[PDB]
mmCIF file of C-alpha atoms in Angstrom:
data_model
loop_
_atom_site.group_PDB
_atom_site.id
_atom_site.type_symbol
_atom_site.label_atom_id
_atom_site.label_comp_id
_atom_site.label_asym_id
_atom_site.label_seq_id
_atom_site.Cartn_x
_atom_site.Cartn_y
_atom_site.Cartn_z
ATOM 1 C CA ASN X 197 0.000 0.000 0.000
ATOM 2 C CA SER X 198 2.199 2.879 1.092
ATOM 3 C CA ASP X 199 5.692 2.499 2.556
ATOM 4 C CA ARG X 200 7.678 -0.266 0.714
ATOM 5 C CA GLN X 201 5.779 -2.846 2.782
ATOM 6 C CA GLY X 202 2.290 -1.365 2.978
ATOM 7 C CA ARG X 203 1.380 -3.876 5.692
ATOM 8 C CA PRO X 204 2.233 -7.534 6.384
ATOM 9 C CA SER X 205 -0.478 -10.190 6.704
ATOM 10 C CA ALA X 206 0.012 -13.562 8.403
ATOM 11 C CA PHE X 207 -2.105 -16.687 8.014
ATOM 12 C CA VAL X 208 -2.328 -20.251 9.225
ATOM 13 C CA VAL X 209 -4.131 -22.376 6.647
ATOM 14 C CA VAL X 210 -5.321 -25.946 7.014
ATOM 15 C CA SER X 211 -5.730 -27.828 3.778
ATOM 16 C CA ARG X 212 -6.711 -31.149 2.320
ATOM 17 C CA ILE X 213 -4.579 -30.093 -0.653
ATOM 18 C CA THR X 214 -1.005 -31.352 -0.424
ATOM 19 C CA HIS X 215 0.255 -30.315 -3.868
ATOM 20 C CA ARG X 216 2.067 -26.984 -3.971
ATOM 21 C CA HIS X 217 1.026 -25.510 -7.315
ATOM 22 C CA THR X 218 -2.684 -26.193 -6.812
ATOM 23 C CA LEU X 219 -2.301 -24.671 -3.344
ATOM 24 C CA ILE X 220 -0.742 -21.369 -4.401
ATOM 25 C CA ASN X 221 -3.323 -20.938 -7.174
ATOM 26 C CA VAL X 222 -6.219 -20.965 -4.708
ATOM 27 C CA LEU X 223 -4.426 -18.296 -2.710
ATOM 28 C CA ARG X 224 -4.248 -16.256 -5.905
ATOM 29 C CA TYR X 225 -7.967 -16.984 -5.996
ATOM 30 C CA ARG X 226 -8.048 -15.551 -2.470
ATOM 31 C CA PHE X 227 -5.441 -12.774 -2.580
ATOM 32 C CA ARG X 228 -6.027 -11.124 -5.928
ATOM 33 C CA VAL X 229 -6.647 -7.914 -3.946
ATOM 34 C CA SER X 230 -3.019 -7.990 -2.877
ATOM 35 C CA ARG X 231 -2.269 -8.896 -6.502
ATOM 36 C CA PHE X 232 -4.039 -5.697 -7.520
ATOM 37 C CA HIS X 233 -1.523 -3.999 -5.223
ATOM 38 C CA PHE X 234 1.343 -6.293 -6.229
ATOM 39 C CA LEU X 235 1.191 -4.511 -9.592
ATOM 40 C CA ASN X 236 0.583 -1.009 -8.230
ATOM 41 C CA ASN X 237 3.841 -0.692 -6.325
ATOM 42 C CA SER X 238 5.455 -2.626 -9.173
ATOM 43 C CA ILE X 239 4.492 0.127 -11.619
ATOM 44 C CA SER X 240 5.192 2.878 -9.067
ATOM 45 C CA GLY X 241 8.794 1.687 -8.961
ATOM 46 C CA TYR X 242 10.768 0.878 -12.115
ATOM 47 C CA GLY X 243 13.915 0.070 -10.189
ATOM 48 C CA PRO X 244 12.642 -0.084 -6.615
ATOM 49 C CA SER X 245 11.654 -3.493 -5.299
ATOM 50 C CA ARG T 66 -35.243 44.730 -46.622
ATOM 51 C CA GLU T 67 -35.036 41.055 -47.591
ATOM 52 C CA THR T 68 -31.560 40.453 -49.011
ATOM 53 C CA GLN T 69 -30.101 41.404 -45.620
ATOM 54 C CA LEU T 70 -31.619 38.371 -43.901
ATOM 55 C CA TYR T 71 -31.099 36.324 -47.063
ATOM 56 C CA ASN T 72 -27.405 37.184 -46.837
ATOM 57 C CA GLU T 73 -27.297 36.400 -43.120
ATOM 58 C CA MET T 74 -29.005 33.077 -43.866
ATOM 59 C CA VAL T 75 -25.962 32.305 -46.003
ATOM 60 C CA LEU T 76 -23.651 33.982 -43.470
ATOM 61 C CA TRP T 77 -24.558 31.824 -40.475
ATOM 62 C CA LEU T 78 -24.692 28.611 -42.532
ATOM 63 C CA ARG T 79 -21.273 29.289 -44.040
ATOM 64 C CA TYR T 80 -20.255 30.468 -40.565
ATOM 65 C CA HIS T 81 -21.571 27.215 -39.114
ATOM 66 C CA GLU T 82 -20.539 24.834 -41.888
ATOM 67 C CA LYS T 83 -17.010 26.091 -41.227
ATOM 68 C CA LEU T 84 -17.123 25.352 -37.486
ATOM 69 C CA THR T 85 -18.516 21.895 -38.264
ATOM 70 C CA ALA T 86 -15.797 21.521 -40.934
ATOM 71 C CA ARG T 87 -13.398 22.445 -38.082
ATOM 72 C CA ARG T 88 -14.771 20.282 -35.269
ATOM 73 C CA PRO T 89 -12.236 19.793 -32.530
ATOM 74 C CA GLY T 90 -12.401 16.028 -32.115
ATOM 75 C CA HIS T 91 -10.066 16.040 -29.121
ATOM 76 C CA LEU T 92 -7.442 13.284 -29.341
ATOM 77 C CA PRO T 93 -5.453 14.328 -26.254
ATOM 78 C CA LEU T 94 -8.527 14.423 -24.025
ATOM 79 C CA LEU T 95 -9.857 11.156 -25.429
ATOM 80 C CA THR T 96 -6.474 9.474 -25.019
ATOM 81 C CA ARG T 97 -6.369 10.437 -21.308
ATOM 82 C CA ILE T 98 -9.928 9.497 -20.469
ATOM 83 C CA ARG T 99 -9.419 6.172 -22.303
ATOM 84 C CA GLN T 100 -6.244 5.560 -20.308
ATOM 85 C CA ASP T 101 -8.022 6.451 -17.092
ATOM 86 C CA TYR T 102 -11.233 4.601 -17.999
ATOM 87 C CA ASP T 103 -9.032 1.523 -18.194
ATOM 88 C CA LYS T 104 -7.232 2.221 -14.930
ATOM 89 C CA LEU T 105 -9.999 2.877 -12.388
ATOM 90 C CA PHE T 106 -11.788 -0.426 -12.974
ATOM 91 C CA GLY T 107 -8.645 -2.270 -11.928
ATOM 92 C CA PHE T 108 -9.142 -0.725 -8.494
ATOM 93 C CA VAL T 109 -12.934 -1.107 -8.472
ATOM 94 C CA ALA T 110 -13.047 -4.835 -9.276
ATOM 95 C CA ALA T 111 -10.732 -5.531 -6.314
ATOM 96 C CA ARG T 112 -12.004 -2.846 -3.903
ATOM 97 C CA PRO T 113 -8.891 -1.886 -1.977
ATOM 98 C CA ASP T 128 -18.224 7.123 -23.097
ATOM 99 C CA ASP T 129 -16.816 6.933 -26.623
ATOM 100 C CA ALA T 130 -17.529 9.663 -29.172
ATOM 101 C CA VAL T 131 -16.469 12.558 -26.963
ATOM 102 C CA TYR T 132 -18.640 14.555 -29.356
ATOM 103 C CA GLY T 133 -22.064 12.933 -29.089
ATOM 104 C CA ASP T 134 -25.127 14.983 -28.189
ATOM 105 C CA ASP T 135 -25.953 12.006 -26.011
ATOM 106 C CA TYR T 136 -22.422 12.382 -24.631
ATOM 107 C CA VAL T 137 -23.530 15.129 -22.233
ATOM 108 C CA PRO T 138 -25.871 12.759 -20.309
ATOM 109 C CA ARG T 139 -23.155 10.130 -20.726
ATOM 110 C CA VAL T 140 -20.943 12.451 -18.683
ATOM 111 C CA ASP T 141 -23.839 13.241 -16.331
ATOM 112 C CA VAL T 142 -24.234 9.543 -15.550
ATOM 113 C CA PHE T 143 -20.494 8.913 -15.473
ATOM 114 C CA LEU T 144 -19.980 11.846 -13.116
ATOM 115 C CA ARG T 145 -22.454 10.069 -10.842
ATOM 116 C CA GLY T 146 -20.685 6.800 -11.635
ATOM 117 C CA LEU T 147 -17.597 8.434 -10.154
ATOM 118 C CA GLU T 148 -19.613 10.096 -7.377
ATOM 119 C CA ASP T 149 -20.791 6.623 -6.381
ATOM 120 C CA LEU T 150 -17.173 5.434 -6.408
ATOM 121 C CA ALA T 151 -15.895 8.523 -4.598
ATOM 122 C CA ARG T 152 -18.613 7.882 -2.004
ATOM 123 C CA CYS T 153 -17.284 4.389 -1.298
ATOM 124 C CA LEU T 154 -13.782 5.852 -0.896
ATOM 125 C CA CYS T 155 -14.490 9.091 0.968
ATOM 126 C CA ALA T 156 -11.167 10.202 2.397
ATOM 127 C CA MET T 173 -7.663 17.209 -1.752
ATOM 128 C CA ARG T 174 -6.426 20.784 -2.150
ATOM 129 C CA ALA T 175 -8.479 23.940 -2.595
ATOM 130 C CA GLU T 176 -6.288 25.237 -5.426
ATOM 131 C CA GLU T 177 -6.612 21.773 -6.989
ATOM 132 C CA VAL T 178 -10.364 22.369 -7.040
ATOM 133 C CA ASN T 179 -9.511 25.825 -8.382
ATOM 134 C CA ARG T 180 -7.279 24.374 -11.126
ATOM 135 C CA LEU T 181 -10.286 22.175 -11.849
ATOM 136 C CA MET T 182 -13.012 24.792 -12.099
ATOM 137 C CA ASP T 183 -11.085 27.734 -13.570
ATOM 138 C CA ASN T 184 -9.922 25.830 -16.647
ATOM 139 C CA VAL T 185 -13.446 24.406 -17.049
ATOM 140 C CA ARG T 186 -15.065 27.843 -17.406
ATOM 141 C CA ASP T 187 -12.418 28.936 -19.901
ATOM 142 C CA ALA T 188 -12.891 25.794 -22.011
ATOM 143 C CA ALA T 189 -16.589 26.648 -22.023
ATOM 144 C CA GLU T 190 -15.593 30.049 -23.435
ATOM 145 C CA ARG T 191 -12.636 28.885 -25.573
ATOM 146 C CA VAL T 192 -14.146 25.666 -27.007
ATOM 147 C CA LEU T 193 -11.634 25.634 -29.889
ATOM 148 C CA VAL T 194 -8.577 25.359 -27.605
ATOM 149 C CA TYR T 195 -8.867 22.883 -24.731
ATOM 150 C CA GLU T 196 -6.103 22.713 -22.142
ATOM 151 C CA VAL T 197 -4.678 19.681 -20.373
ATOM 152 C CA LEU T 198 -3.490 19.841 -16.768
ATOM 153 C CA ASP T 199 -0.863 17.601 -15.187
ATOM 154 C CA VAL T 200 -3.105 17.071 -12.134
ATOM 155 C CA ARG T 201 -1.579 18.639 -9.050
ATOM 156 C CA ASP T 202 -1.153 15.376 -7.010
ATOM 157 C CA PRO T 203 -1.742 15.944 -3.255
ATOM 158 C CA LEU T 204 -3.744 12.820 -2.541
ATOM 159 C CA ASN T 205 -3.253 9.120 -1.829
ATOM 160 C CA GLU T 206 -0.711 7.154 -3.840
ATOM 161 C CA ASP T 207 -3.223 4.343 -4.413
ATOM 162 C CA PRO T 208 -4.031 3.682 -8.106
ATOM 163 C CA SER T 209 -7.546 4.967 -7.476
ATOM 164 C CA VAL T 210 -7.083 8.286 -5.703
ATOM 165 C CA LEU T 211 -4.457 9.493 -8.151
ATOM 166 C CA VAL T 212 -6.289 8.280 -11.263
ATOM 167 C CA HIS T 213 -9.768 9.024 -9.900
ATOM 168 C CA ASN T 214 -8.580 12.596 -9.333
ATOM 169 C CA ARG T 215 -7.606 12.646 -13.007
ATOM 170 C CA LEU T 216 -11.186 11.776 -14.007
ATOM 171 C CA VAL T 217 -12.268 14.266 -11.376
ATOM 172 C CA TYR T 218 -10.756 16.725 -13.844
ATOM 173 C CA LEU T 219 -11.036 14.849 -17.137
ATOM 174 C CA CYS T 220 -14.783 14.465 -16.769
ATOM 175 C CA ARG T 221 -15.484 18.054 -15.774
ATOM 176 C CA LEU T 222 -13.506 18.984 -18.870
ATOM 177 C CA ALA T 223 -15.666 16.570 -20.853
ATOM 178 C CA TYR T 224 -18.624 18.226 -19.141
ATOM 179 C CA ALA T 225 -17.112 21.538 -20.260
ATOM 180 C CA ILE T 226 -16.370 20.826 -23.925
ATOM 181 C CA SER T 227 -19.467 18.785 -24.738
ATOM 182 C CA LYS T 228 -21.995 21.164 -23.144
ATOM 183 C CA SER T 229 -20.498 24.378 -24.433
ATOM 184 C CA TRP T 230 -20.352 23.045 -27.969
ATOM 185 C CA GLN T 231 -24.103 22.478 -27.748
ATOM 186 C CA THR T 232 -24.719 25.988 -26.411
ATOM 187 C CA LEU T 233 -22.866 27.696 -29.262
ATOM 188 C CA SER T 234 -24.341 25.357 -31.876
ATOM 189 C CA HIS T 235 -27.935 25.814 -30.721
ATOM 190 C CA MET T 236 -27.185 29.543 -30.735
ATOM 191 C CA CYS T 237 -26.054 29.066 -34.328
ATOM 192 C CA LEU T 238 -29.178 27.050 -35.076
ATOM 193 C CA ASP T 239 -31.430 29.640 -33.407
ATOM 194 C CA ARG T 240 -29.894 32.437 -35.476
ATOM 195 C CA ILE T 241 -30.711 30.406 -38.581
ATOM 196 C CA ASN T 242 -34.229 29.396 -37.494
ATOM 197 C CA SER T 243 -35.047 33.028 -36.763
ATOM 198 C CA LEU T 244 -34.076 33.724 -40.371
ATOM 199 C CA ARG T 245 -36.242 30.768 -41.361
ATOM 200 C CA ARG T 246 -39.239 32.769 -40.121
ATOM 201 C CA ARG T 247 -37.756 35.717 -42.016
ATOM 202 C CA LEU T 248 -37.694 33.659 -45.221
ATOM 203 C CA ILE T 249 -41.186 32.364 -44.685
ATOM 204 C CA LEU T 250 -41.809 36.080 -45.173
ATOM 205 C CA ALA T 251 -39.969 35.766 -48.477
ATOM 206 C CA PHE T 252 -42.757 33.407 -49.536
ATOM 207 C CA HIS T 253 -45.107 36.124 -48.219
ATOM 208 C CA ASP T 254 -43.834 38.371 -51.053
ATOM 209 C CA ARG T 255 -45.277 38.590 -54.548
ATOM 210 C CA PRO T 256 -45.994 34.995 -55.630
ATOM 211 C CA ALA T 257 -43.196 34.483 -58.095
ATOM 212 C CA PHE T 258 -42.235 30.882 -58.715
ATOM 213 C CA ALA T 259 -38.751 31.240 -57.297
ATOM 214 C CA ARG T 260 -40.424 32.760 -54.240
ATOM 215 C CA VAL T 261 -42.194 29.425 -53.921
ATOM 216 C CA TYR T 262 -38.896 27.752 -54.786
ATOM 217 C CA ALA T 263 -37.229 29.783 -52.033
ATOM 218 C CA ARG T 264 -39.560 28.500 -49.317
ATOM 219 C CA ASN T 265 -39.543 24.911 -50.632
ATOM 220 C CA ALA T 266 -35.768 24.970 -50.148
ATOM 221 C CA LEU T 267 -36.080 26.674 -46.740
ATOM 222 C CA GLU T 268 -39.045 25.147 -44.857
ATOM 223 C CA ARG T 269 -36.796 22.717 -42.947
ATOM 224 C CA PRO T 270 -34.826 22.991 -39.699
ATOM 225 C CA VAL T 271 -31.036 23.122 -39.756
ATOM 226 C CA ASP T 272 -29.209 20.735 -42.090
ATOM 227 C CA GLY T 273 -25.429 20.454 -42.372
ATOM 228 C CA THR T 274 -25.578 18.810 -45.791
ATOM 229 C CA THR T 275 -28.902 20.096 -47.171
ATOM 230 C CA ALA T 276 -28.584 23.849 -46.550
ATOM 231 C CA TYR T 277 -25.023 24.027 -47.852
ATOM 232 C CA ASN T 278 -25.765 22.139 -51.064
ATOM 233 C CA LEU T 279 -29.014 24.161 -51.166
ATOM 234 C CA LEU T 280 -27.113 27.475 -51.029
ATOM 235 C CA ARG T 281 -25.152 26.530 -54.156
ATOM 236 C CA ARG T 282 -28.313 25.995 -56.191
ATOM 237 C CA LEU T 283 -29.961 29.358 -55.547
ATOM 238 C CA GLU T 284 -28.709 31.525 -58.389
ATOM 239 C CA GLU T 285 -32.416 31.376 -59.215
ATOM 240 C CA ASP T 286 -32.852 33.415 -56.029
ATOM 241 C CA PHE T 287 -30.306 35.957 -57.236
ATOM 242 C CA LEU T 288 -32.502 36.005 -60.326
ATOM 243 C CA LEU T 289 -35.573 36.040 -58.064
ATOM 244 C CA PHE T 290 -34.937 38.999 -55.792
ATOM 245 C CA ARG T 291 -33.561 41.230 -58.558
ATOM 246 C CA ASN T 292 -36.811 40.489 -60.373
ATOM 247 C CA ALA T 293 -38.584 41.114 -57.060
ATOM 248 C CA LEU T 294 -37.273 44.404 -55.649
ATOM 249 C CA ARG T 295 -34.720 45.550 -58.351
ATOM 250 C CA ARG B 66 18.030 29.550 -82.261
ATOM 251 C CA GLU B 67 20.882 28.517 -79.966
ATOM 252 C CA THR B 68 20.839 31.497 -77.610
ATOM 253 C CA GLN B 69 17.088 30.899 -77.279
ATOM 254 C CA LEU B 70 17.691 27.285 -76.293
ATOM 255 C CA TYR B 71 20.623 28.310 -74.117
ATOM 256 C CA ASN B 72 18.293 30.802 -72.469
ATOM 257 C CA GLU B 73 15.931 27.833 -72.230
ATOM 258 C CA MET B 74 18.482 25.673 -70.378
ATOM 259 C CA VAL B 75 19.210 28.515 -67.970
ATOM 260 C CA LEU B 76 15.500 28.869 -67.268
ATOM 261 C CA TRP B 77 14.760 25.144 -66.811
ATOM 262 C CA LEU B 78 17.703 24.646 -64.480
ATOM 263 C CA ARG B 79 16.989 27.667 -62.286
ATOM 264 C CA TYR B 80 13.403 26.365 -62.284
ATOM 265 C CA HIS B 81 14.714 22.964 -61.194
ATOM 266 C CA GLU B 82 17.073 24.432 -58.590
ATOM 267 C CA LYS B 83 14.325 26.614 -57.119
ATOM 268 C CA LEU B 84 12.033 23.565 -57.090
ATOM 269 C CA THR B 85 14.425 21.077 -55.471
ATOM 270 C CA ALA B 86 15.412 23.628 -52.833
ATOM 271 C CA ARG B 87 11.736 24.009 -51.894
ATOM 272 C CA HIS B 91 5.398 21.274 -46.683
ATOM 273 C CA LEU B 92 5.290 21.710 -42.908
ATOM 274 C CA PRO B 93 1.459 22.047 -42.520
ATOM 275 C CA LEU B 94 1.300 18.838 -44.577
ATOM 276 C CA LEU B 95 3.933 16.597 -42.996
ATOM 277 C CA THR B 96 3.848 17.732 -39.350
ATOM 278 C CA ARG B 97 0.125 17.365 -38.674
ATOM 279 C CA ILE B 98 -0.015 14.020 -40.521
ATOM 280 C CA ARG B 99 2.903 12.634 -38.492
ATOM 281 C CA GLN B 100 1.604 13.939 -35.153
ATOM 282 C CA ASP B 101 -1.861 12.487 -35.746
ATOM 283 C CA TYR B 102 -0.468 9.169 -36.991
ATOM 284 C CA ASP B 103 1.277 8.822 -33.634
ATOM 285 C CA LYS B 104 -1.935 9.590 -31.729
ATOM 286 C CA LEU B 105 -4.770 7.963 -33.703
ATOM 287 C CA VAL B 137 5.526 9.895 -47.527
ATOM 288 C CA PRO B 138 5.943 6.082 -47.886
ATOM 289 C CA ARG B 139 4.745 6.306 -44.290
ATOM 290 C CA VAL B 140 1.708 8.220 -45.583
ATOM 291 C CA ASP B 141 0.626 5.674 -48.222
ATOM 292 C CA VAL B 142 0.726 2.778 -45.755
ATOM 293 C CA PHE B 143 -1.074 5.088 -43.342
ATOM 294 C CA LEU B 144 -3.495 5.733 -46.201
ATOM 295 C CA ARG B 145 -3.750 1.935 -46.373
ATOM 296 C CA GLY B 146 -4.036 1.989 -42.576
ATOM 297 C CA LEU B 147 -6.777 4.636 -42.504
ATOM 298 C CA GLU B 148 -8.886 2.459 -44.802
ATOM 299 C CA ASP B 149 -8.521 -0.279 -42.173
ATOM 300 C CA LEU B 150 -9.319 2.093 -39.299
ATOM 301 C CA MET B 173 -19.942 10.515 -45.347
ATOM 302 C CA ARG B 174 -21.788 12.309 -48.119
ATOM 303 C CA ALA B 175 -21.240 12.084 -51.879
ATOM 304 C CA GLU B 176 -20.479 15.805 -52.352
ATOM 305 C CA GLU B 177 -17.822 15.845 -49.636
ATOM 306 C CA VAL B 178 -16.103 13.152 -51.721
ATOM 307 C CA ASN B 179 -16.682 15.198 -54.889
ATOM 308 C CA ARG B 180 -14.758 18.117 -53.376
ATOM 309 C CA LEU B 181 -12.256 15.573 -52.013
ATOM 310 C CA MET B 182 -11.227 14.190 -55.387
ATOM 311 C CA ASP B 183 -11.524 17.672 -56.938
ATOM 312 C CA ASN B 184 -8.905 19.372 -54.757
ATOM 313 C CA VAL B 185 -6.638 16.317 -55.001
ATOM 314 C CA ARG B 186 -6.684 16.495 -58.805
ATOM 315 C CA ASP B 187 -6.369 20.297 -58.849
ATOM 316 C CA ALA B 188 -3.500 20.684 -56.379
ATOM 317 C CA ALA B 189 -1.620 17.901 -58.179
ATOM 318 C CA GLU B 190 -1.257 20.309 -61.120
ATOM 319 C CA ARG B 191 -1.377 23.527 -59.046
ATOM 320 C CA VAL B 192 1.564 22.162 -56.974
ATOM 321 C CA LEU B 193 2.658 25.526 -55.573
ATOM 322 C CA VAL B 194 -0.810 26.818 -54.603
ATOM 323 C CA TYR B 195 -2.576 24.138 -52.539
ATOM 324 C CA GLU B 196 -6.210 24.562 -51.480
ATOM 325 C CA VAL B 197 -7.272 23.852 -47.899
ATOM 326 C CA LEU B 198 -10.685 22.233 -48.108
ATOM 327 C CA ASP B 199 -10.684 22.246 -44.341
ATOM 328 C CA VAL B 200 -13.160 19.576 -43.618
ATOM 329 C CA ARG B 201 -16.840 19.666 -44.513
ATOM 330 C CA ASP B 202 -17.704 17.985 -41.149
ATOM 331 C CA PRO B 203 -21.117 16.327 -41.634
ATOM 332 C CA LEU B 204 -19.684 13.151 -39.989
ATOM 333 C CA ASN B 205 -20.275 11.689 -36.526
ATOM 334 C CA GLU B 206 -19.306 13.432 -33.279
ATOM 335 C CA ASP B 207 -16.551 10.963 -32.337
ATOM 336 C CA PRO B 208 -13.092 12.520 -32.483
ATOM 337 C CA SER B 209 -11.668 9.478 -34.269
ATOM 338 C CA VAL B 210 -14.190 9.445 -37.539
ATOM 339 C CA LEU B 211 -13.795 13.122 -38.413
ATOM 340 C CA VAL B 212 -10.085 12.644 -37.705
ATOM 341 C CA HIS B 213 -10.039 9.588 -39.987
ATOM 342 C CA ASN B 214 -11.828 11.519 -42.727
ATOM 343 C CA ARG B 215 -9.625 14.620 -42.384
ATOM 344 C CA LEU B 216 -6.460 12.511 -42.453
ATOM 345 C CA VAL B 217 -7.506 10.609 -45.576
ATOM 346 C CA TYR B 218 -7.829 14.063 -47.160
ATOM 347 C CA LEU B 219 -4.266 14.774 -46.070
ATOM 348 C CA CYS B 220 -3.091 11.351 -47.244
ATOM 349 C CA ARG B 221 -4.820 11.807 -50.603
ATOM 350 C CA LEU B 222 -3.392 15.324 -50.904
ATOM 351 C CA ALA B 223 0.198 14.529 -49.915
ATOM 352 C CA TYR B 224 0.251 11.528 -52.235
ATOM 353 C CA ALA B 225 -1.008 13.892 -54.937
ATOM 354 C CA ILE B 226 1.835 16.231 -53.947
ATOM 355 C CA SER B 227 4.221 13.259 -54.100
ATOM 356 C CA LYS B 228 3.098 12.232 -57.593
ATOM 357 C CA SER B 229 3.349 15.875 -58.657
ATOM 358 C CA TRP B 230 6.840 16.043 -57.173
ATOM 359 C CA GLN B 231 7.895 13.020 -59.219
ATOM 360 C CA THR B 232 6.351 14.318 -62.447
ATOM 361 C CA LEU B 233 7.836 17.816 -62.115
ATOM 362 C CA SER B 234 11.326 16.616 -61.210
ATOM 363 C CA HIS B 235 11.408 14.002 -63.979
ATOM 364 C CA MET B 236 10.196 16.495 -66.591
ATOM 365 C CA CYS B 237 12.764 19.060 -65.434
ATOM 366 C CA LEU B 238 15.407 16.387 -65.913
ATOM 367 C CA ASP B 239 13.853 15.441 -69.274
ATOM 368 C CA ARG B 240 13.700 18.927 -70.767
ATOM 369 C CA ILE B 241 17.293 19.687 -69.810
ATOM 370 C CA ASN B 242 18.175 16.289 -71.315
ATOM 371 C CA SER B 243 16.340 17.257 -74.503
ATOM 372 C CA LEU B 244 18.213 20.570 -74.518
ATOM 373 C CA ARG B 245 21.456 18.656 -73.878
ATOM 374 C CA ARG B 246 20.798 16.972 -77.230
ATOM 375 C CA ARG B 247 20.559 20.389 -78.907
ATOM 376 C CA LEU B 248 23.751 21.564 -77.220
ATOM 377 C CA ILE B 249 25.810 18.656 -78.483
ATOM 378 C CA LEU B 250 24.246 19.706 -81.776
ATOM 379 C CA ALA B 251 25.579 23.141 -80.831
ATOM 380 C CA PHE B 252 28.959 21.408 -80.515
ATOM 381 C CA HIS B 253 28.266 20.076 -84.020
ATOM 382 C CA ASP B 254 27.929 23.729 -85.231
ATOM 383 C CA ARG B 255 30.744 25.179 -87.516
ATOM 384 C CA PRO B 256 34.021 25.244 -85.678
ATOM 385 C CA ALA B 257 34.438 27.506 -82.618
ATOM 386 C CA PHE B 258 36.685 27.046 -79.593
ATOM 387 C CA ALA B 259 33.966 27.404 -76.984
ATOM 388 C CA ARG B 260 31.791 25.032 -79.028
ATOM 389 C CA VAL B 261 34.276 22.349 -77.996
ATOM 390 C CA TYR B 262 34.049 23.516 -74.380
ATOM 391 C CA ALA B 263 30.250 23.619 -74.808
ATOM 392 C CA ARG B 264 29.943 19.842 -75.154
ATOM 393 C CA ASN B 265 32.687 19.064 -72.623
ATOM 394 C CA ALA B 266 30.644 20.923 -70.042
ATOM 395 C CA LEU B 267 27.395 19.361 -71.220
ATOM 396 C CA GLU B 268 28.075 15.688 -71.998
ATOM 397 C CA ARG B 269 26.847 14.721 -68.539
ATOM 398 C CA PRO B 270 23.260 13.856 -67.511
ATOM 399 C CA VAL B 271 21.372 16.338 -65.436
ATOM 400 C CA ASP B 272 22.515 16.761 -61.828
ATOM 401 C CA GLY B 273 21.830 19.407 -59.219
ATOM 402 C CA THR B 274 25.121 20.789 -57.923
ATOM 403 C CA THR B 275 27.260 20.079 -60.996
ATOM 404 C CA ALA B 276 25.361 21.922 -63.727
ATOM 405 C CA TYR B 277 24.559 24.746 -61.291
ATOM 406 C CA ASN B 278 28.286 25.330 -60.841
ATOM 407 C CA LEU B 279 28.769 24.992 -64.606
ATOM 408 C CA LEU B 280 26.320 27.857 -65.275
ATOM 409 C CA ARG B 281 28.702 30.291 -63.615
ATOM 410 C CA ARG B 282 31.554 28.718 -65.593
ATOM 411 C CA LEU B 283 29.641 29.004 -68.886
ATOM 412 C CA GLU B 284 30.542 32.678 -69.072
ATOM 413 C CA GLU B 285 32.561 31.505 -72.072
ATOM 414 C CA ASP B 286 29.395 30.320 -73.870
ATOM 415 C CA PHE B 287 27.876 33.772 -74.117
ATOM 416 C CA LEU B 288 31.000 35.080 -75.819
ATOM 417 C CA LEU B 289 30.685 31.955 -77.964
ATOM 418 C CA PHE B 290 27.206 32.787 -79.233
ATOM 419 C CA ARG B 291 28.107 36.399 -79.961
ATOM 420 C CA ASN B 292 31.116 35.188 -81.957
ATOM 421 C CA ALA B 293 29.114 32.365 -83.575
ATOM 422 C CA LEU B 294 25.672 33.813 -84.357
ATOM 423 C CA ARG B 295 26.026 37.667 -83.905
#
């Protein structure tokens, strides 16, 4: 969001799913709102990271 | 007289035809709304129109101002001079419709991709509310100057019933017409032969 | 006459040098709109067809044909503007007018330059026939200057060095 971190967010997730790639995709299903903002401070900085 | 208002009938139409020949189809403004029309809906779908010249475009802005007022209501958090850079250039563009100015928006607000880019369409839609309305005001003033002369050239048919008097009205008993009046003007050397036979 | 055709080759070449030395309201507004919306222009004319009354088109082809022969004095049909309110269709109609006009300017530029080369080449035939005339000393220098096809800087410099040829034609034709 604002200050080279914005804010950190911690989770503990139980899952039937053991496979890694099918697991991260349903978090992209969940955390597209961060992925809105994962582009916004990616376009705000061409050179920052 | 009669050839005064017959001349001014040609004067406003050639004065209008020229403006319409010269329509300022704004590319810079359209490019910047189209960029920002793309960019706000990235924010809105996550929640953290076209012919900028259409008559219908003025209620398109009137809805889309409220479409932004409904999105500025959901994100109610902006400088006073910023609102002055907004409104002062709007009133000039309503008076200087030929030359429309672009402002690199003065950036005091949140660095989120909404509140920067929404503030752009805070200004790029009041400018679209400036250019589109004020074109209609000057054009309807041009059409009202012509339609007043239309009543004046009904009175040409009220003259002595020559045939080209009846040909004058039958070319002139219509409201404004970009294509018809202009083509119509070219085929009225009969009327130059009419009025000289009328009032010498 | 030889001094009449030498006065003719002076006139064609100063015509050609004035022409090749010599449009900003054509090229600038085409290029700036092409970035927003002459081999560039024809493909952009092909592009504008990818991207309207009858009269409007009658004026359109009229001014294109007229300014192709009236190369110096180009008419500005503005734009008739009976088209839709969108900035892009009036822009696409106005730019086709500029693409049809500049391509008419381009074809006129090729016809004028080639004819200016042709008529000096036809006069070059008469001037080697001037070399063929009787026997004078600058007649020999007349061909040796002029046995070269028509070029911009070379024959322009030769015109100042053909101060011998006017004293030729006085001594040859009086």
